[PDB]
Amino acid sequence: GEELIGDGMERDYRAIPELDAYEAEGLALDDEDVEELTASQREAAERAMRQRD
Amino acid sequence: RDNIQGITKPAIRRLARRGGVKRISGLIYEETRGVLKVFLENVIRDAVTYTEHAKRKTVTAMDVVYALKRQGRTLYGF
Amino acid sequence: STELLIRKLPFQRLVREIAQDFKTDLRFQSSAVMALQEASEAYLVGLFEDTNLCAIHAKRVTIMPKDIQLARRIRGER
């Protein structure tokens, strides 16, 4: 049974530059043009996903 | 690598504070973590599928929008 | 445009971990991770609102996992 408002609030809202931004690793290696889904590509996916029992 | 523990006790209080929540039980932290894991798994699995069908390995923001709309969520901005 | 709920580095590393369960050589767009983060924060803030009501109904200030589970059940998530 914990409480959420009062002393110690300020501390929860501190800025941590190190954690407040996204890492290079995991993200796309370069700014290359990415192929966006057509109606066919979207449907064949949507059909398969429903067909997942 | 157990990266669900990255949805820390501070981050769970900040979300509940924003939710209007006055006080919180202890069991909530591992409950909230589980609710997030499941939502993220179901949304990512659908997103990865759109990436595969469009014959690429890069998850775009629109693969995320299509996955969300299927899972009943609609994000403004696209 | 700034919002401090879930921290950005631990969020990314969780999305990266969950995508690994489904597919290898997956890269995300900065835009893609940002989409999933706005989506998760919006889902959890909104669910924290609904779980808050369930507590008030049982006439309690302190939110319990029975409130999270009820809110989710009525939404048709179980």
Residue numbers in the entry:
A (entry chain C): 69 to 121
B (entry chain B): 23 to 100
C (entry chain A): 57 to 134
Show passages lifted from the paper.
MCM2 is positioned at the core of the replisome as a subunit of the replicative helicase MCM2–7 that unwinds DNA and separates the two strands of the double helix prior to the action of DNA polymerases. To gain further insights into the mechanisms involved in histone management during replication, we have solved the structure of the ternary complex between the histone-binding domain of MCM2 and the histones H3-H4. Free in solution, the MCM2 domain is mainly unfolded but, upon binding to histones, it wraps around the surface occupied by DNA in the nucleosome. The interaction with MCM2 induces a conformational change of helix αN of histone H3 and competes with the binding of H2B.
The complex reconstituted by mixing MCM2 (69–138) with full-length histones H3-H4 was crystallized and diffraction data were recorded at 2.9 Å resolution. One molecule of each protein H3, H4 and MCM2 is present in the asymmetric unit. After refinement, electron density is observed for residues S57 to R134 of histone H3, R23 to F100 of histone H4 and G69 to D121 of MCM2. The crystallographic symmetry reconstitutes a tetramer of histones H3-H4 which closely resembles that of the nucleosome structure (Cα RMSD of 1.12 Å) showing that the binding of MCM2 is compatible with the formation of the H3-H4 tetramer. The MCM2 fragment (69–121) wraps around the H3-H4 dimer complex and follows the position of DNA in the nucleosome so that it clearly competes with the binding of DNA. MCM2 residues G69-L97 and V102-R120 have extensive contacts with both histones H3 and H4 and adopt mainly an extended conformation interrupted by two helical segments: one helical turn involving residues M79-Y81 and a well-defined helix from residues A107 to R118. A network of polar and charged contacts are formed with the side-chains of three arginine residues of histone H4 (R35, R36 and R39) that establish close contacts with the DNA in the nucleosome. In particular, the Y81 side-chain docks exactly into the same position as Y53 in the αN helix of histone H3. Y90 docks into an apolar cavity at the interface between α1 and α2 helix of histone H3 while MCM2 chain wraps around the DNA binding region including histone H3 R63. The first part of this segment adopts an extended conformation and competes with DNA binding and the second part corresponds to a helix that docks on histone H4 in a more apolar groove.
